[PDB]
Amino acid sequence: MKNIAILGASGSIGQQAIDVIARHPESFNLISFTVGKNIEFAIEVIEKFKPEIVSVQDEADVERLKPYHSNIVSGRQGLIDVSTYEKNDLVLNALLGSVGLEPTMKAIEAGKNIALANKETLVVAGKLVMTHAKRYGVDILPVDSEHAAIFQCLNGEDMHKIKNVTITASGGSFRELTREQLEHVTVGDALNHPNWSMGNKITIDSATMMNKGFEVIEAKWLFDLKIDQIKTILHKESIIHSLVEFVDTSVMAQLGTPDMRMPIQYAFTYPERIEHRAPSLDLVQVAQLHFQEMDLDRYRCLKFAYDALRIGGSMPVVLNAVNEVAVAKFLNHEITFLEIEHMIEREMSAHEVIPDPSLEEILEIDHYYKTKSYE
Amino acid sequence: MKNIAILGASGSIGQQAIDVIARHPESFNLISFTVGKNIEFAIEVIEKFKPEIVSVQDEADVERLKPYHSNIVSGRQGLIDVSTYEKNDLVLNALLGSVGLEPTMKAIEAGKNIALANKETLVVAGKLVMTHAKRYGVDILPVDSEHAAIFQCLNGEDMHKIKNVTITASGGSFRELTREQLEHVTVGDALNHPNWSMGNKITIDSATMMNKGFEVIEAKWLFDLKIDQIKTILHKESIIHSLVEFVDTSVMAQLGTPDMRMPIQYAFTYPERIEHRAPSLDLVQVAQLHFQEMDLDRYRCLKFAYDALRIGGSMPVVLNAVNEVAVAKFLNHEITFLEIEHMIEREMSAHEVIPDPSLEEILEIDHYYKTKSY
Ligand SMILES: O=CN(O)CCCP(=O)(O)O
Ligand SMILES: O=CN(O)CCCP(=O)(O)O
């Protein structure tokens, strides 16, 4: 048996990881998990999976759960408790935004392997989080279409012989608009995403191209690449999930239907793969696959991400913190769509960067930008 | 450092590998090489690399190369001593035809890693060379954009967990035509394809899809496959060279330029890779990749290889030898295009079928069908 911890269990990635657990009672177990605010979901999981400890993200909800369960934690500590439980053999982080940083930190400290779906952990503190993995003898296991993809293409490969990697972008809801028309998009239209869903924050990030920019950074720390090693390309159908090129011009791609359970389960069964009872990718049905050169004028958020990469230090913490606040304000009909872009540029032009932020200053800056006034 | 040996050196592939040796003096030297035919090329290749043993076709030619160094051989035995030169570390078998079979086999026994550029040996002696390769503790690598893909896809994986394999197809010169319009086809419109480069025999195989039939049979033995795996798809751009799917549903693939210096050089370096100075694959310039189902009514030649595979034994040897003569004759205007599909079909249906041939059966069954009357 492997004992699995799910951090973001009430989310898209978390749900899909519970199905995987529900498709393999023989090899997996759900030992601990975390929700936020979807308490009905928690009761369903507790009455099916028999987990030992559950954490809510708000204390008032503890006693809605206390009949069904006895070991109920809550809040900030409730996260570390569920990610550091000693019966944990593997921790899956499906939290969004930097809320997930601190628990993987404390989980690593406890010598526990990490399947990492939470992107911004590596965006705000990649290099901090990696050099912590070495030193505790724990590995970081990507669970994210684009990065699970790169990962499998490197099996039996010397990472030293990578020329570049290319990360594929679907282009989000507004891929067939020019900025001119973007003055006119509603929240409803932004939420109607092409290829996956995945929840609302990822859907807007995908339309902003922040999602890919976050992943170009995550990829720099996973695979130890340079800025010129990271390319992007626009792939409408989202079949090819990424591709790496080696110094001998051989190029490797991984393919699938936009379904997250495969990368999740491989991150549970590495380096063995086991059967996944689901329809296979039928290249004959898809008929054709498109590729267009990335446009950095149409998606300036991907240019900011590159810029947060080449400045370094604490600039990535700001790009993430303000994006978290800009996307929330957009979904609450507080700002317009192109506002997300302009909000981000401001705080970055002003940021006084810290070269090698420790954890506490990273969590500091992130707090400053999430509670600052945007007027 | 590795000392390489090339058997079909005057050949198209043997020369591209000579370049792949010449770009990397830090990793390769050519220690021994074989040539029949072209004696000129030998002298230009002796002067550069000064290798330690040579073979010619005809002992008649032995005399012209006495003055350029000492250790020269010829004939059937000639091929063997350069195959099993104890200074070789990897031996590239580049001579197309039934001549490739025995040299390879003796090189396996001398314990030499083999690079297989001869499509013949694994269509015709698959179970043989493979069981012997496992017997003598040596691996067969592929130069071949198709099988070098599979090799790179499975690198770092448990072959036990393969679902399918899918080799990719361009469809030859007549992809856009129907078997009805191919009553009107000529030898000149058969060769209007990018495979035109040393494709005289290979373009025809591409036009009839014998070419990929041949590689599903090689795949079956090289990667220990069952027939229900090994699928095939029409991919017009020929950028994706092959797909592998695992029991978890994941799908790997290798994509590339149409440059055979790439697999050649990967073959040489097997676990390693190392720098190949050519233009990379720009995916934004080939805007799309197309994918149509394989139609076995439309390419009866492809069913014929799945047929030869379904039976086993000596039946694949009949396929290679007859397709050889039927393709050869079509080019001499002795035979019309659709006949190749018929000429093979008749001989196949009539063939007697030996269950587990040995080398000499295989060689004799090959000779008879190449030289009989049609
Ligand atoms: O793990 C999945 N994603 O990060 C979403 C990929 C979609 P896109 O590049 O359009 O956002
Ligand atoms: O061995 C020959 N080839 O790999 C040439 C590929 C062209 P085809 O795709 O139609 O087989």
The 10 Å Cβ neighbour count of residue A223 is: 18
A86, A313, A149, A79: which is closest to A217 by C-alpha?
A: A313
Output the six-digit token pair for A140: 């970081």
Residue B234: strand pairing partners: B169, B292
B53-65 CB burial, b ≥16 within 10 A, e <16? bbbbbeeebeeeb
How far apart CA B117 and CA B100 sit, in angstroms, is 9
Task: Give the minimum alpha-carbon distance from B369 to chain A in angstroms, rounded to a whole number.
Answer: 38
How do A53-56 and A240-246 pair as beta strands?
unpaired
Q: Is the CB of B269 under 6 A from ligand 2?
A: no
In whole angstroms, how large is the CA radius of gyration of chain B?
A: 21
Q: Are B316 and B101 in contact (CB under 8 A)?
A: no
Residue pointed to by tokens 């920019």: A213
Experimental method: X-ray
Instruction: Write the Ramachandran bin of A266: left for phi over 0, alpha for psi from -120 to 50, otherwise beta.
Output: alpha
The B292-293 sheet, strands edge to edge: A292-293, A230-234, A162-169, A240-246, A251-255, B251-255, B240-246, B162-169, B231-234, B292-293
Contact, A224 vs A159, CB < 8 A?
Answer: yes
Q: Spell out the residues 6+ positions from residue A330 whose beta carbon is closer than 8 angstroms to its own.
A: A187, A190, A204, A336, A337, A339, A340
Amino acid at position B28, single letter? F
Question: From CA A70, how far away is CA A65, in angstroms rounded?
Answer: 8
Judge whether A39 and A63 are in contact, CB under 8 Å: no
Instruction: Enumerate long-range contacts of A75-83, CB under 8 Å, 24 or more apart.
Output: A76/A102, A78/A34, A79/A7, A79/A34, A79/A55, A79/A103, A80/A106, A80/A107, A81/A53, A81/A55, A82/A5, A82/A7, A82/A32, A82/A33, A82/A34, A82/A53, A82/A54, A82/A55, A83/A5, A83/A7, A83/A107, A83/A112
Interface of A with B in 163-202 (CB under 8 A): 163, 166
Q: Is the CB of B232 under 6 A from ligand 2?
A: no
Please state, in angstroms and rounded to a whole number, the distance separating the CA atoms of residues B240 and B236: 10
Q: Are B195 and B183 in contact (CB under 8 A)?
A: no
How many residues can be counted in chain A?
Answer: 375
The tokens 């979904």 sit on which residue? A331
Question: What phi, psi does B372 have (nearest 5°)?
Answer: -60, -170
Which of B278, B283, B293 lies closest to A233 in CB terms?
B283
- Return the closest-CA partner of residue A96 out of A205, A174, A241, A181: A205
Ligand 1 binding pocket (C-beta < 6 A) is A 144-145, 169-170, 172, 196, 206, 211-212
Which among B131, B129, B132 is positioned nearest to B142, based on CA atoms? B129
Of A167, A212, A254, A259, the residue with max ligand 1 atoms within 8 A of its CB, to mutate for a pocket test, comes to: A212
A167 alpha carbon – ligand 1 mean position (Å): 10
Separation of CA B206 and ligand 2 centre (Å):
6
- Cβ-contact B129, B121 below 8 angstroms: yes
Instruction: List all residues 6 or more positions away from A231 whose beta carbon is below 8 Å from its beta carbon.
Output: A164, A165, A166, A167, A294
CB atoms within 10 A of CB B247: 16
Domains (range + CATH), chain A = 1-144 (3.40.50.720), 145-295 (no CATH), 296-375 (1.10.1740.10)
The answer to whether B71 and B31 have CB atoms below 8 angstroms apart is: no
In this structure, what are the phi and psi dihedrals at residue A42, rounded to the nearest 5 degrees? -65, -45
| Strand pairing category for B72-74 and B90-93 | unpaired
Give dist(CA B312, CA B317) in Å, integer: 10
Q: Give every CB contact of residue A224 below 8 A, 6+ residues apart in sequence.
A: A159
Tokens representing residue B73 in the block:
């051989």
Resolution expressed in Å = 2.9
How many Å apart are CA B144 and CA B148, to the nearest integer? 6
Contact A21, A48 (CB under 8 A): no
| Cα–Cα distance measured from residue B79 to residue B101, given in angstroms and rounded to the nearest whole number | 11
Q: Is B292 exposed, middle or buried, given 0-12, 13-18 or 19+ CB atoms closer than 10 A?
A: middle
Query: Is A157:A131 a contact under the CB 8 Å cutoff?
Result: no
Chain B residues 284-313 with CB within 8 Å of chain A: 284, 286-293
Task: Retrieve residue B92's tokens.
Answer: 């590239």
Q: Inter-chain contact A248–B257, Cβ cutoff 8 Å? A: no
Instruction: Report how far residue B59's alpha carbon sits from residue A186's, in angstroms, rounded to the nearest whole number.
Output: 84
Reduced 3-state DSSP string for B127-163: HHHHHHHHHCCCCEEECCCCHHHHHHHHCCCCHHHEE
